[PDB]
Subunit: 291 residues, 6 copies
């Protein structure tokens, strides 16, 4: 019962994803293809990374994650396929996902295949990895790949072979760590007692505001549920509220909530109202907090 | 072959739906997850109810409907899981869906699991129910559920157990009828002999206009499939046309069609052209009809 | 392990697609339903045609393509079901799809079902057909079809019967070629030394510009990779670049690339930036190429 | 105390109008320059014509109207200067303007100067003319005119000489009527019992809708105040109201009024609310009236 | 050297204002017509009032202010003409306007003429008045006024007669105070130590934010230049800064400035950047301050 | 007959300009105020400079130019008032404006008064100056100027005294050249034989595109009035056409015209159609030209 979870920048407005899927079912007849999402900003490797980093612990062991934005499509570049180490514990407090005490995942149970353009930076950072290979074998990719469609040729197709049981180590040569491209992760800074980060994402479709300031960054500063915080955005739009577990703790609908989101990051919203949209708040805006 | 049909307000721009599906496949290996939609206006329980109310007759018996907008996420609230009675009939008459005379559905063949926030209001009304339960057992939800993600913790996860055959009656204690939250549905009022309701929906992607004025309000009002009607929208925009069963009945492409949609409601459209978009017609605009 | 690949104009904002899928699983329990896309401009049969013409080579043999925009829903019209001949080769070079040398697909191995409104024009033109039938039998359509929902009644339902192995030739009577509605598709005009055509699509979500000028058109003007081209859009934008296999060949990010897209068509783009969006280029603008 | 009333397409965002005015004061020191408007759609001679045709009765005799959109700037074309005949009566009733019984204006008492491009079509049609001359003498235009600024060179400058009392007939040679370019203005079609025309303008900033159906058209169909009308816009909006003198007659704020505008034309509006803006009604949509 | 300062909702996109002006020059040949503005939101008497209330002290004594939005155009209503008492001292601290110690204006030196719909509410409140008359005489208004153009018929025209020296008391009968329509002025409230008002206006074209909280309201609370204030808008977007005389006191470009505007009202801006526009701040938003 | 020509960033939506004009008429009873424009992007000293630099030759001698964007309003800064030397010549050659051979202007015939913030940079460059003074005397500015309104206090008021004949040399102390702030103007650079500048302006309302590439840069570059040029905008959008003196030279309506505007700068337009608006071309986009 193999699964491929598929994240691309292909969109859902034409037959691009369906072409990849027909091939995935062709190669791995028993496969289930789960869409992650296909709407990411094209070529934004950092955004793509956020949609894939936390997936492992939610999926059955043995799942393959086919994850791709491929701006270098048609170049001599080749995908990397990696077996991760730990399916972390996560959340706004960390754990295995699921009912009861959650579903514990054995180590080395998930493979990602992606362009080697840094898309997997946070996956490897958070999960570690046991082995990594360049994807080059004509057994798992086209002999004559379509130049403009490497997301199909060098990700979807080889991902189906992996799901179909093709030995990972057979895809191509091992990659040394330095050969795996990484993006730079801007660190959360300290300015006096405040923490300076950025708005990492607008949380669609709610218009919640996510920062890159993490629960661990907060607890490093003696900040926990119930602390009166001031959070400034874009350096000028400021906000004040206690840190609360969830939206409704803000009281009335529309009231500001400052909370930790399901990924453990300091976030800000309105209670059952959109914060970001009325004010055109955006990813990339400076975000500063302080108790 | 167990099915979960999944309707949420989570959107399709991030990994939120994938986290839920991952856990569904973890819990019910042989499951098939069918997306209903994930684009509903967040926290609009009335809109979400429209997308789920007439699902059962289209699905195989035993299908589990996981349906959720959860603005009370992270509070002491718990989901409700119900077995509905009649699978029923829809369109502008009431009947069974499918080829030939349609496929009859045995009573009690479908389970809905949703936040107890009135989302199931119209489902219970149209279908009735045989049993309803609070969803509390750590066999079917997390012992430590993520505060801001009850759509996953309190709907997606438990739905997967139900699809897998976990006894409904064991999810938690039984709920009395009064304990199941309902939303209020505004009635069609009378002014002279005109009926006065609202635009219940813009029917995307076509730009058709759906009213809350039902067949029954028309019938035993005098209006039948050939009546010249005057339909005024937003208190300003008047349209005139015979009541017809379909769009092409309007004749020329672009001509006004006033018809009954499949849910039996008075609707208005242009024939193979968009009515709503050019005039910027919107949900909630008043709608008035007279013969 | 039957597959229905499903392309409609139903959108993804309500339960319309889900109703169709529920019925597909009801009729063909072992079915896999693969979404192609549901976001096409309603009633734009030429656009719908673009999303379906290239599908066959990507899917396992026996796949049924349920493809539909149905502005004549509720009339006496009936759908057409056709068995295609060639699952063609049609990409930038013209090859079978998949790893190695590709998956060669047998002839006569795919069925399309669609309104008989010309939606299948390019499918038949490119692939040919072995047999075609009007879809009328109450064994595969409803005796009392919902007037406004022929995409479900006259496509989704019968596609599931076909996928379950209901004999093609039993859906209804044979259609003569002339009874199969086609739309006209203008040729590329071999103007003097130039090839004259149109922008056929904006390639979402990248903003790439696709023309209807196919590689075969380029051949016979003797135009291949390396050729210094002038591609003039909208009559006033004389873009100049060599024809290259892919985006990165243009060098700097944002630089213009002229290339052959994965459908085999002459296209223009910027390297890892959007061409169409910033300058609001649109489908239907003139496209002229020359070396 | 000479007056130039100045209507151009120059906008109010740069120094173009000021350059013209500086020159007007340089040439005719005692002049008063009255702005008509400068915001017309560039090169839309029919719109420009609407803003100037009704001016004469409002201004003191001897007023010079410098009116210009000049897309043929920098060519061999030269402007036309005309002395009109009747300063007409033309409002909802047809009267002289001002307190008491109005200011009766003598005949032959206003001069227009404009590009000879049809801008003056309705001026001549409504008022008649006594004499017309091509504007060529170096006494009133530059010997070396700025190619891209004929509105200044060939209108503003010569208008100031005219206002300073430079003899009309000395600007250049007499033009034969046929040498005076006119645009065609379609009539209201006396369709059966109805009068068929167009939306001629959206009345900014109120969003009122003006049609080209003049009170004289209404007369002779026997339509006057009190008449219950059906005014159908855009072919599909059958507005119904009595023809009333003014907006408030419609009763409640937002109620539809059908009236005669201050130019004498059949118009439709909402009482102290906007009709055109919310529903995006536009100039050029069909307009049909009938009682 | 009479002056009429003219404020209307007529806009500047057609010949409406020019019609009024031609008549003003016709009636009062020596007049200068100064535009105040013509862009006000139609029928917003409160906004119109803000554009006229502070004008007197800037203008030569004897100036007539013709000020009009006329939603009741064509009804039996008639304008009011009033001679004000004091040309106040104003500003963010109050005074006569001009060089040196300013230009002191004698009492009873200005007349406003306007519809009697409350437009003059704040004029009379701030300036007092010496006498008021209904404008009804056929010596100063048309015998047959155009129904839809009372801003011309009942304001522009009579204003020119006043400028021309027609005795004010001759316009019509005296009006008692209760016959002069007033709008309700929402008071600035106190909530603990805070002051609650509203955003009274977005200050175009800068995007500065003006409140209805006045310098006197502030100094009633012991708040003066240099006080650290918290100002919340829309109940959620908060801001912190000392009260400073001007924008540049904020330091760096873009920094928040809280200041008193030239009309003496508590305002908020960014230093040489727009505050309102990036965040879509709007008039009507709650505004609260507190030291 | 004294004239003030008035250019500001105050807009035309409130009473700001009227307050200034009121004081101008108070101080200089016989003055004529001519609006240049009031719509400039606030605080953009480069844009404001474009609207005032070529004014003098169009105006009668003795005209006072009051020109202001004042983001340093309320600081210790004071305005500068200068008498310019040559009135000069403009267009694409340099000459006098007006009928016949134009009207020559004696040297030293114009005074500008502006904030000392570089607004006059191009004025001084193009015209030279005979004398410059800091504006400080309480004879010409307020003793207590409103902090947020230096455009009125430090420009409008003093300009009116100057127009009235207040001796320039008495407004304050003389300024040395180095004390007059200038802005830096980016030069046209060379790449190969292409000239590389910027779009200096979108020429509203026509949508013409103005570059900072001047006649002189072209001349003594090889480019003359018949040269086939390639003009690339924003580094992407290419246009081709001969250099022509005007729009109609392009031939067909809509055709590309590359020309010199009146200020002598390389510009590009469509003939009697808008270039900028459909392609969303903007100020500041790079512009590159090659023969
Ligand atoms: N700002 C907000 N206020 C209240 N509820 C919110 C919210 N943002 C997301 N949710 C709710 O959280 C649930 C699980 Cl993610 C989603 O279904 C969504 O309805
Ligand atoms: N206003 C309209 N005119 C003509 N056809 C329409 C329509 N709205 C929906 N459909 C057509 O109804 C089918 C079943 Cl929902 C869809 O495929 C859509 O094409
Ligand atoms: N204009 C462009 N420049 C660079 N890369 C591009 C591109 N358009 C699509 N792709 C890349 O092509 C891959 C297969 Cl469609 C997609 O994943 C997308 O990332
Ligand atoms: N792109 C263009 N094509 C044709 N005519 C144009 C133009 N831009 C400005 N004008 C014309 O130039 C005259 C002097 Cl500025 C204005 O009245 C305007 O009509
Ligand atoms: N649709 C409408 N309803 C009510 N009043 C209206 C209106 N359109 C214009 N006016 C009013 O008519 C006056 C003369 Cl044009 C203007 O001042 C304007 O206020
Ligand atoms: N937020 C702001 N920051 C800096 N200066 C500003 C401003 N708003 C208006 N002004 C400046 O104030 C002058 C007098 Cl009203 C105007 O010309 C305008 O340039
Ligand atoms: Cl969250
Ligand atoms: Cl935006
Ligand atoms: Cl598990
Ligand atoms: Cl319902
Ligand atoms: Cl809880
Ligand atoms: Cl492409
Ligand atoms: Cl667009
Ligand atoms: Cl009107
Ligand atoms: Cl629009
Ligand atoms: Cl201010
Ligand atoms: Cl907005
Ligand atoms: Cl004075
Ligand atoms: Cl310059
Ligand atoms: Cl100071």
């Amino acid at each position: 019962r193999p699964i491929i979870a598929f994240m691309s920048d292909l969109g859902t407005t034409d037959d691009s994803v369906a072409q990849c899927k027909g091939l995935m079912y062709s190669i791995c007849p028993d496969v289930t293809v789960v869409d992650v999402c296909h709407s990411m900003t094209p070529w934004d490797v950092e955004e793509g990374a956020r949609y894939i980093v936390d997936l492992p612990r939610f999926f059955p062991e043995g799942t393959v994650f086919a994850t791709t934005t491929y701006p270098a499509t048609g170049t001599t570049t080749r995908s990397v396929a990696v077996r991760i180490k730990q399916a972390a514990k996560g959340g706004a407090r960390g754990q295995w996902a699921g009912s009861g005490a959650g579903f514990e995942r054995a180590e080395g149970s998930y493979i990602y295949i992606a362009p080697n353009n840094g898309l997997l930076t946070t996956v490897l950072e958070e999960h570690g990895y046991l082995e990594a290979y360049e994807v080059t074998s004509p057994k798992v990719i086209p002999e004559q790949p379509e130049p403009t469609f490497y997301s199909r040729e060098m990700v979807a197709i080889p991902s189906a072979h992996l799901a179909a049981g093709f030995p990972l180590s057979e895809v191509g040569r091992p990659l040394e760590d330095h050969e795996i491209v990484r993006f730079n992760r801007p660190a959360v800074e300290q300015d006096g007692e405040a923490l300076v980060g950025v708005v990492s994402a607008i949380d669609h479709p709610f218009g919640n505001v996510w920062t890159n300031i993490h629960r661990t960054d907060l607890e490093k500063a003696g900040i926990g549920y119930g602390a009166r915080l001031r959070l400034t955005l874009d350096g000028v739009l400021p906000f004040e509220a206690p840190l609360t577990p969830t939206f409704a703790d803000a009281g009335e609908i529309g009231n500001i909530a400052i909370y930790l989101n399901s990924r453990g990051y300091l976030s800000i919203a309105r209670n059952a109202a959109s914060l970001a949209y009325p004010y055109h708040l955006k990813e990339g805006m400076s975000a500063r907090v302080e108790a």
